[PDB]
Design a protein around this ligand. Structure first.
Ligand SMILES: O=c1oc2cc(O)cc(O)c2c2ccccc12
Length: 113
């Protein structure tokens, strides 16, 4: 297996690169529940990049799949909650596309560790 600290260095850089694709900063912080009062009704597990950074430092991500699972939640939650003809829905589609390539490259670096 691998050493913890270089893996976490790689996840930190990967998280920064995914945030870079969210040019609108739509997903930087939790969805404001005080402004979306019905959000938790059908979104079981909210996720966002700030929570992911906290989970990263809290060792919730010890393999690439758990990291990618929470990124996929950011995307899938947004596709689920929002109608297809919204800015939010299209932002999540774009993040899924642009983020997918970021993750493939980062995983190949992890797979060399
Ligand atoms: O998925 C979202 O849906 C929203 C719906 C709204 O009506 C209002 C919102 O501020 C959001 C929102 C804000 C930040 C990140 C994601 C979302």
């Amino acid at each position: 297996e691998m050493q913890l600290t270089p893996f976490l260095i790689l996840l930190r850089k990967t998280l920064e690169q995914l945030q870079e694709k969210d040019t609108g900063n739509i997903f930087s912080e939790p969805v404001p529940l005080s402004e979306v009062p019905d959000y938790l009704d059908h979104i079981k597990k909210p996720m966002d990049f700030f929570t992911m950074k906290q989970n990263l430092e809290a060792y919730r991500y010890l393999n690439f799949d758990d990291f990618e699972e929470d990124f996929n939640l950011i995307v899938s939650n947004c596709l689920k909650y929002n109608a297809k003809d919204t800015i939010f829905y299209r932002a999540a589609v774009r993040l899924r596309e642009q983020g997918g390539a970021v993750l493939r490259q980062a995983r190949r670096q992890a797979e060399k560790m």
